[PDB]
Amino acid sequence: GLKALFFDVQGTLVDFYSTITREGEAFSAVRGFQADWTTVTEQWRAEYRSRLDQVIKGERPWTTTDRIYREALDGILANHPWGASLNSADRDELNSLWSKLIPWDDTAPGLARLRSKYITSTLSNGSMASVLRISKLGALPFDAILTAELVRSSKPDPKVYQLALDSVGIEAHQAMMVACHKYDLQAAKRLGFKVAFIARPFEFGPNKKVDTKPEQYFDYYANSVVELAGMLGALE
Amino acid sequence: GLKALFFDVQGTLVDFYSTITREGEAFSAVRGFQADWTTVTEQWRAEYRSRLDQVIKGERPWTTTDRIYREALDGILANHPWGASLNSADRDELNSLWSKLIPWDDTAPGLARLRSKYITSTLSNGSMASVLRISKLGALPFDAILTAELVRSSKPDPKVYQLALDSVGIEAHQAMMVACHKYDLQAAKRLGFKVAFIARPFEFGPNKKVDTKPEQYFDYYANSVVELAGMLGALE
Ligand SMILES: [Ca+2]
């Protein structure tokens, strides 16, 4: 009997691409600048992923994801003419967008229906501070906020998923992992979780290949959190 | 400026005395025993607190709060003549009441007013699973659910208060600890937190004397979460 649902956040529930682009161009429209924010996002994510690789590879000490995004921003703005005009405080403002990630239109209605039938919680690699603020700013209801920062690691570390089971007080087969990333669902299913895949074809913006094809080990396959709620029988 | 409020749960927000005594009485009606549940309650908590102190002093391995309550229950049932007539399943049902504690009348309206103005989170010694279920069952809104289980300790360990600051991403002077127990606010105020004391004159039942006098280090003294919300300017 399913009892709790754990949701990945970035990409699965929120649209970080549209957030960085539209809030960046407004950030540059206030000071007077001109930059391709689509290429800014890829570089920021690349530096963010170039540096978190080092953390678990041992080439960088552990630090919250907000700090990694802030430091990655310093590395990418060195390759931009307007980057020097942004002081230490201007770059903190830019970095705070990761705590303001805009939700997909189906996220709030689907989460509310699921919470009325199950225990719901986050389980993502982001910082607790950012995920907390993303859910509060977006009025996304959860019964708890859990990130891998609570065990100083990141998915697919088995102890991140054990954190979910220990915190909610249930066994693996009573829990479901919801995500748009297949490495997440593979690791959770290995540990006995149920897994629900949410196809997010626009996660990385236009002209990007996204693997959304169904897999046999998926317990559920949906194109929205609202659709997943209907499959689980979580009505209005 | 205040940014986040952290709440103790047991006693501060929920009435465990009334939950145990009444639900224990209802539990006993269909099983054929009558007991004085005001003494069973304080025997349970005394047994729990003694086994908990063994975990703290290193004389017993760490387990969740629910497991200590469950073993304390086995302890007190051995001292009552009707204890043997309760099998393991009956005792798990009795022990589950620690996850169903009813809130005080003021808790739900006060938390919602405070959440519309601040980030709010729990920060108690209970288990994550029980505090999570207490808020879900009682419709107590929090932006986050934190307990000392997340650092495998107990207040007033400074690690528990640092967990609150790390998870929400603020500094001590921007956080307030809200509790009905003075030991909690003493440690938090020592660590830079603001502190709000909520007087719960009936935390331990009708005729047990309770320390509710004001203290000079309190930033706020209230008799309800509703009153604290008014003192902080958080109107409906
Ligand atoms: Ca919440």
Amino acid (one-letter) located at A126: G
Which of B82, B99, B116 delimits the end of a domain?
A: B99
What is the maximum span of chain A, computed from C-alpha positions, in angstroms? 57
Asked if B167 lies within 8 A of A136 by C-beta distance, the reply is no
Is A120 in the same domain as A223?
yes
Question: Quick one: resolution in A?
Answer: 2.0
Distance of CA A207 to the CA centre of its chain: 21
Asked if B144 lies within 8 A of A143 by C-beta distance, the reply is no
Is B151 in the same domain as B220?
yes
A209, A213, A218, A219 alpha-carbon torsion, rounded to 10° = 110
Cα gap A58→A52, rounded to integer Å:
10
Q: Flag whether A187 is in a domain.
A: yes
Strand B102-103, strand B194-198: pairing: unpaired
C-alpha neighbours within 13 Å on the C-beta side of residue B31: 20
CATH number of the domain enclosing B48: 1.10.150.240
Is A36 in the same domain as A132?
no
CATH number of the domain enclosing A148: 3.40.50.1000
Is A55 in the same domain as A108?
no
Q: Flag whether B174 is in a domain.
A: yes
Which of A59, A74, A99 delimits the end of a domain?
A: A99
Is B111 in the same domain as B197?
yes
- Chain B residues touching residue A132 (CB < 8 angstroms): 119, 121, 143-144, 167-169
Is A184 in the same domain as A115?
yes
Is A118 in the same domain as A227?
yes
- Report the gap between the CA of A64 and the closest CA in chain B (Å): 9
Considering only CA atoms, which of B6, B12, B10 is closest in space to residue B172? B6
| B142 annotated binding-site participant | yes
CA angle B70, B71, B77 (to 5 degrees): 90
Domain range spanning residue A134?
4-15+101-231
Residue of A134, A166, A170, A171 best to disrupt the B interface, most CBs of B under 10 A: A166
Into how many domains does chain A fold? Answer: 2
Cα gap A50→B229, rounded to integer Å:
45
Q: How was this structure determined?
A: X-ray
Q: Flag whether B236 is in a domain.
A: no
Q: Reading across the β-sheet that carries B119-124, which strands appear in turn?
A: B144-147, B119-124, B4-7, B175-179, B194-198, B220-222
Is A76 in the same domain as A156?
no
Q: Flag whether A236 is in a domain.
A: no
Asked if B136 lies within 8 A of A119 by C-beta distance, the reply is yes
Window B:27-86, CB contacts with A under 8 Å: 64, 66
Q: Which CB contacts under 8 angstroms, 24+ apart, belong to A177-183?
A: A177/A6, A177/A8, A177/A123, A178/A5, A178/A6, A178/A7, A178/A8, A178/A12, A178/A225, A178/A228, A179/A7, A179/A8, A179/A12, A180/A8, A180/A11, A180/A12, A181/A8, A181/A11, A181/A12, A182/A211, A182/A215, A183/A155, A183/A156
- Chain B residues touching residue A135 (CB < 8 angstroms): 143
- Report the gap between the CA of B81 and the closest CA in chain A (Å): 31
- Report the gap between the CA of A54 and the closest CA in chain B (Å): 22
Which of B99, B117, B149 delimits the end of a domain?
A: B99
Q: At what angle do helices A65-77 and A88-95 cross, to 10 degrees?
A: 120
Window A:163-222, CB contacts with B under 8 Å: 166-170
- Report the gap between the CA of B3 and the closest CA in chain A (Å): 12
Asked if B143 lies within 8 A of A144 by C-beta distance, the reply is no
Asked if A168 lies within 8 A of B64 by C-beta distance, the reply is no
Across chain A, how many H-helices and E-strands are there? 9, 7
Q: Flag whether A61 is in a domain.
A: yes
Is B58 in the same domain as B90?
yes
Residues 6+ apart with CB under 8 A from A184: A8, A155, A156, A177
Ligand 1 mean position to A93 CA, how many Å? 25
